[PDB]
Design a protein around this ligand. Structure first.
Ligand SMILES: C[C@H]1CCCC[C@H]1Oc1cccc(-c2nc3cc(C(N)=[NH2+])c(F)cc3[nH]2)c1[O-]
Ligand SMILES: [Ca+2]
Ligand code: NA
Lengths: 33, 11, 250
């Protein structure tokens, strides 16, 4: 249930699930130092 | 400018 | 979204569109957190100052979209609402403090490559990610300029700003239930959410487990992308107990 959410929440079919990155997510990851 | 949707969704 | 780009297909599978049946118009953005629950900003549904008070029957929720105006046959799903719950202490009189609402759908939706829920944060994730300097992402079909609307979903990545800076950019009283984000005038980069984007998600990607979490809801701003100004978002983690409660009560 929540805590996280629907268990498989936040993993995108077209990206995470296929190990593909979208064009600007790296920007985010890089800002976390 | 919104295209119409299936009448069925208004009800 | 101002100074943002077109999203990629399936980039934000949790993005929802609140659609009005008569007139048929985009009302606000929203997010899919379950197969039966949508999360939005309470001011998109109830805002007495302008005489706005929408009920179940006046809205439609459209999930799986990319194009703003077209009925994407075989891709998006349109659900009707069963119930709407507004936070009991939503403050429309003064600063839109606790600007959150939950909508229960008539039937569960099925996930697809374009429809998938977002995760809600937990204390630890909020703690480690909600730090000034860290960037989040906002999406929506809202205005492209303060003073038109895009053909597809737009996206922009913005840094979280130090609370002092947020408070010193406005006259409004900021509470612990909001945070602000955006670039400072001496940063070069621009970007902000705008009218039409209200209700949608501000999300971050955890570098620990690779999941996307929704940290904020687009709440308000003064103008769109003005220098010295920032966008304010509802702090989802601080209101989580309310979320859990209605979802495990209804
Ligand atoms: C669509 C109706 C629904 C009922 C009452 C609110 C009204 O919505 C709105 C009407 C006019 C402006 C906005 C709006 N401006 C906004 C500006 C910003 C920003 N960061 N600069 C934002 F995040 C959300 C906004 N939302 C807005 O959300
Ligand atoms: Ca890890
Ligand atoms: Na700004």
């Amino acid at each position: 249930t929540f805590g996280s959410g629907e268990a498989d929440c936040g993993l995108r079919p077209l990206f995470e699930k296929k190990s593909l990155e979208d064009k600007t997510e790296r920007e985010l990851l890089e800002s976390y130092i | 400018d919104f295209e119409e949707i299936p009448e069925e969704y208004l009800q | 979204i101002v100074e943002g780009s077109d999203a990629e297909i399936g980039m934000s599978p949790w993005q929802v569109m609140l659609f009005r049946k008569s007139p048929q118009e985009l009302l606000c953005g929203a997010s899919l957190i379950s197969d039966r629950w949508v999360l939005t900003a309470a001011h998109c549904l109830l805002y007495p100052p302008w005489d706005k008070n929408f009920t179940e029957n006046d809205l439609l929720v459209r999930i799986g979209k990319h194009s703003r105006t077209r009925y994407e046959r075989n891709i998006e799903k349109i659900s009707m609402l069963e119930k709407i719950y507004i936070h009991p202490r939503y403050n429309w009189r003064e600063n839109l403090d606790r600007d959150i609402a939950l909508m229960k759908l008539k039937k569960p939706v099925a996930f697809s490559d374009y429809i998938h829920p977002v995760c809600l944060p937990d204390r630890e994730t909020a703690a480690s990610l909600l730090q000034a300097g860290y960037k989040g992402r906002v999406t929506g079909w809202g205005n492209l300029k303060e003073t038109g609307q895009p053909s597809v979903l737009q996206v922009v990545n913005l840094p979280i700003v130090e609370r002092p800076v947020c408070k010193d950019s406005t006259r409004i009283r900021i509470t612990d239930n909001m945070f602000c984000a955006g670039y400072k005038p001496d940063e070069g980069k621009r970007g902000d959410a705008c009218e039409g984007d209200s209700g949608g998600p501000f999300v971050m990607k955890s570098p620990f487990n690779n999941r996307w979490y929704q940290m904020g809801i687009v709440s308000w701003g003064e103008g769109c992308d003005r220098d010295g100004k920032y966008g304010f978002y509802t702090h989802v983690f601080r209101l989580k107990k309310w979320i859990q409660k209605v979802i495990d009560q209804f």
